[PDB]
Ligand binder design. Structure first.
Ligand code: 1P8
Length: 129
């Protein structure tokens, strides 16, 4: 990994309290699963590598980066305390794309397709038991 990309978001921290919830289980088993296999997932499956993409201003603009590879690791190595934290990561990922890129750009259309799917699934986020 290039020194000119930031370190990725935190995925492991023993000091942060962790909990499994049914909602977090749904986020992994249903939401992440659904979005990961989408035809348009690939740009979002890992941190933006601004060096390889020749976007030297990316991390000048995007100060709260997030991606589904990070979210997958956070879900699989349960990082979260609640589903809101994970939903916020997805929302951050989409908003980064919409802030950095022009409306109607391919990457935006791809993000918008994943977000539509995401919204459908989050509307069915089960009641916390
Ligand atoms: O917004 C972003 C993230 C990203 C992922 C993939 C490609 Br190609 C371009 C970009 N720019």
């Amino acid at each position: 990994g290039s020194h000119m990309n930031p370190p990725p978001p935190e995925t492991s921290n023993p000091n942060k309290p962790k909990r499994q919830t049914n909602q977090l289980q749904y986020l992994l088993r249903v939401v992440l699963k659904t979005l990961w296999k989408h035809q348009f997932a690939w740009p979002f499956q890992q941190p933006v590598d601004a060096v390889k993409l020749n976007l030297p201003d990316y991390y000048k603009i995007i100060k709260t980066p997030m991606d589904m590879g990070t979210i997958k690791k956070r879900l699989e190595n349960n990082y979260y305390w609640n589903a809101q934290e994970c939903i916020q990561d997805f929302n951050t990922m989409f908003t980064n794309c919409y802030i950095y890129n022009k409306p109607g750009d391919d990457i935006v259309l791809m993000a918008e397709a994943l977000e539509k799917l995401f919204l459908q699934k989050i509307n069915e986020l089960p009641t916390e038991e």
